[PDB]
Amino acid sequence: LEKETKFQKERLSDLKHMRYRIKDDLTTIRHSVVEKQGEWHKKWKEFL
Amino acid sequence: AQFLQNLLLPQAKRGSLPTPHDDHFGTSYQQWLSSVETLLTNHPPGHVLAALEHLAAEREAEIRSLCSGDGLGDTEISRPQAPDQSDSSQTLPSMVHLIQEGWRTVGVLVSQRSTLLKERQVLTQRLQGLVEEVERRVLGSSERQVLILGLRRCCLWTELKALHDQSQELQDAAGHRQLLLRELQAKQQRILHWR
Amino acid sequence: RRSFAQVLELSAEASKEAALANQEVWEETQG
Amino acid sequence: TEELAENILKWRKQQNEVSSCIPKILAEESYLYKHD
Amino acid sequence: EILEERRLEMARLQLAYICAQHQLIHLKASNSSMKSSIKWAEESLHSLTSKAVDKENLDAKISSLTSEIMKLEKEVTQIKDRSLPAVVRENAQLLNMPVVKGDFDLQIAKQDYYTARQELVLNQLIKQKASFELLQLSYEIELRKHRDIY
């Protein structure tokens, strides 16, 4: 029983770690998306 | 109640011309007078009071039945819906989720473009070797000029046909978009008339 | 449940990024 | 749960590498078409 | 900030969609063109072995092919400047109604309920007014009876 308890606490630790790193990936992707859309909007505003 | 409903029938909500219901002021009143004459003649005011108390309790319990709608599960209480509104309650995607499905469609388009790269680069070499075989054969300058002109004509006619096909397809998409937009504006005037 | 929430959100944003990259490259090459 | 985790992250990295590799393919195809 | 971000999200969907379908249009048109080029190169490489064009006929077909190329080129040019980009821009600017139909339908599904329940309240007041009018009319009839017997 104490073995299962240690595996589920390590399990939830890994879950919170993967949540945080996919959140960081979300931030990086959103930053790139914002920069690309700023460039596109400026370029096509000058174009049209 | 029919008399007061004709009094409180909304004139602006009437699609036809407004009907001044003075015939409902008079003839319905006379029929009501006959019914009230029978009611008062056959019956005492005391059990009139008893039955009026009973009907006031009926109206109070009629309101109480709708007040007692909290018998459902008190878990995330939101969306006050119509009584038995289940079939028409389609799971419309939210502000984000519609854009999620749209980005799924554009990602499918991205995969289609990625396959288009491989297809176009593989089939490009067929035309390249075909024009190289045109150059390889023993043909005159005028023959090769006719070959180039016909190659360009066969490019242009079918490219123009494909341009028409894609332009009319996206114009049909815009037409379906406006066919959805007409429902939007009609529902907007419905909400304004509701106000 | 919240994990599915951010999975769908990041899927939308990643397909958005793919669309932006493809649009940028098409404007780079075709003009 | 973690199986779909590496599944989703491999799809996202795969499409990202494809998006980055579209430039060279399009440049090669456009320069092949623009050269007789 | 969240509403501004979501309006920007819709505007970015339009931003991508301004060229997203246009890429597919250009790619499919180019692919149809190069399939037709492949088929014409094949057909003419097969035909020139069997059929030999005379030099006067070579120049006549040069004139005919070129005269059709100018018309095909101007008709293609008509569908690359202000016809395709305006259509795709209209399609992008018409990416609103999936949101607007749901947002209108939720409030309308609530508004039919509002109309029905407010008309129920109105009919409750109407029934109460009817009962009070009946009771007052009975009182007036009793008063008239009292005066007449008096």
Swiss-Prot record, chain A:
Where does the record place it?
Answer: Cytoplasm, Cytoskeleton; Cytoplasm, Cytoskeleton, Spindle; Cytoplasm, Cytoskeleton, Microtubule organizing center, Centrosome
Q: Which domain of life is it from?
A: Eukaryota
According to its UniProt record, how is this protein modified after translation?
Phosphorylated during mitosis.
Stated name of the protein: HAUS augmin-like complex subunit 6
Q: What does this protein do?
A: Contributes to mitotic spindle assembly, maintenance of centrosome integrity and completion of cytokinesis as part of the HAUS augmin-like complex. Promotes the nucleation of microtubules from the spindle through recruitment of NEDD1 and gamma-tubulin.
Counting on the full-length protein, the chain here runs from 337 to 384 of 955
The family assignment reads: Belongs to the HAUS6 family.
Subunit (UniProt)? Component of the HAUS augmin-like complex. The complex interacts with the gamma-tubulin ring complex and this interaction is required for spindle assembly. Interacts with PLK1, NEDD1 and gamma-tubulin. Interacts with EML3 (phosphorylated at 'Thr-881').
Curated annotation (Swiss-Prot), chain C:
The record's subcellular locations are: Cytoplasm; Cytoplasm, Cytoskeleton, Microtubule organizing center, Centrosome; Cytoplasm, Cytoskeleton, Spindle; Cytoplasm, Cytoskeleton, Spindle pole
Signal sequence interval, chain numbering: none
Q: Family, per the entry?
A: Belongs to the HAUS8 family.
**What do we know about how this protein assembles, alone or with others?**
Component of the HAUS augmin-like complex. The complex interacts with the gamma-tubulin ring complex and this interaction is required for spindle assembly. Associates with microtubules. The interaction with microtubules is strong during mitosis, while it is weak or absent during interphase. It is unclear whether this interaction is direct or indirect. Interacts with EML3 (phosphorylated at 'Thr-881') and TUBG1.
Described function: Contributes to mitotic spindle assembly, maintenance of centrosome integrity and completion of cytokinesis as part of the HAUS augmin-like complex.
Q: What is this protein called?
A: HAUS augmin-like complex subunit 8
Instruction: Name the source organism.
Output: Homo sapiens
The gene name reads HAUS8
From Swiss-Prot, chain D:
| Assembly notes | Component of the HAUS augmin-like complex. The complex interacts with the gamma-tubulin ring complex and this interaction is required for spindle assembly. Interacts with EML3 (phosphorylated at 'Thr-881').
Role summary: Contributes to mitotic spindle assembly, maintenance of centrosome integrity and completion of cytokinesis as part of the HAUS augmin-like complex.
Q: Where in the cell is it found?
A: Cytoplasm, Cytoskeleton, Microtubule organizing center, Centrosome; Cytoplasm, Cytoskeleton, Spindle
Family assignment from sequence similarity? Belongs to the HAUS2 family.
* Protein name (database record): HAUS augmin-like complex subunit 2
Q: Which organism is it from?
A: Homo sapiens (Human)
From Swiss-Prot, chain E:
Q: Which residues form a coiled coil?
A: 53-84
Location in the cell reads:
Cytoplasm, Cytoskeleton, Microtubule organizing center, Centrosome; Cytoplasm, Cytoskeleton, Spindle
Signal peptide (from-to): none
UniProt keywords (A-Z) are: Acetylation, Cell cycle, Cell division, Coiled coil, Cytoplasm, Cytoskeleton, Microtubule, Mitosis
The record's GO CC annotations read: centrosome; ciliary basal body; cilium; cytosol; HAUS complex; intercellular bridge; microtubule cytoskeleton; microtubule organizing center
**Record's subunit section:** Component of the HAUS augmin-like complex. The complex interacts with the gamma-tubulin ring complex and this interaction is required for spindle assembly. Interacts with EML3 (phosphorylated at 'Thr-881').
Describe the family membership recorded for this protein in Swiss-Prot or TrEMBL: Belongs to the HAUS3 family.
Q: What is this protein called?
A: HAUS augmin-like complex subunit 3
The source organism is Homo sapiens
Q: Which gene encodes it?
A: HAUS3
Intact protein stretch covered?
Answer: 253 to 402 of 603
